[PDB]
């Protein structure tokens, strides 16, 4: 339900694309209705805790996650199935906040791999694929576990 799930997905994607030298403002389609990116207060605190959690894991495991994105298909059609079956496996040990750190970090790296392959138009679709999964499976577990506001109090 909550549109904030997409707003915090856009931020860590757009930052990873900016570190590769790319521009989200050129890839973005059309603005929807209301509310902006996480630059305020409590949503900016989620973003900050989540960014350090991704950045430390990317230092220690750059090789592992780059080899994991190399086998995953990212083109429309088969990718929507190829992503689902792999994400349903990485949460199979538990739906915990530690596996949510891996889920977002993998999705952000897949978006980069698409732009780097000259498939920049998919930045909108790959972001929707992970945000739709996050609404379909994680959102009720996230709210039962105190929301992203609890994640920043645990990991910030």
């Amino acid at each position: 339900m909550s549109q904030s799930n997409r707003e915090l997905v856009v931020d860590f994607l757009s930052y990873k694309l900016s570190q590769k030298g790319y521009s989200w403002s050129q890839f973005s389609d059309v603005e929807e209705n209301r509310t902006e990116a996480p630059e305020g207060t409590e949503s900016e605190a989620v973003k900050q805790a989540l960014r350090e959690a991704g950045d430390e894991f990317e230092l220690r495991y750059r090789r592992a996650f780059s080899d994991l994105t190399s086998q995953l298909h990212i083109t429309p059609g088969t990718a929507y199935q190829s992503f689902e079956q792999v994400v349903n496996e990485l949460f199979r040990d538990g739906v915990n906040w530690g596996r949510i750190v891996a889920f977002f970090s993998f999705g952000g790296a897949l978006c980069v791999e698409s732009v780097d392959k000259e498939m920049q138009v998919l930045v909108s679709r790959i972001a929707a694929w992970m945000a739709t999964y996050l609404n379909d499976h994680l959102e009720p577990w996230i709210q039962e576990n105190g929301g992203w506001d609890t994640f920043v109090e645990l990991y910030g």
């Binding site: 894991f57 220690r60 080899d67 994991l68 086998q71 530690g98």
Partner: peptide, 25 residues
């Protein structure tokens, strides 16, 4: 583990399991 046509287990049973040394974040 050996390879299967449905899942690259020889590679993925490494990368997913290799992360054991950090409980994320």
């Amino acid at each position: 583990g050996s390879h299967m046509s449905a899942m690259s287990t020889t590679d993925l049973e490494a990368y997913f399991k290799d992360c054991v040394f950090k409980d994320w974040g």
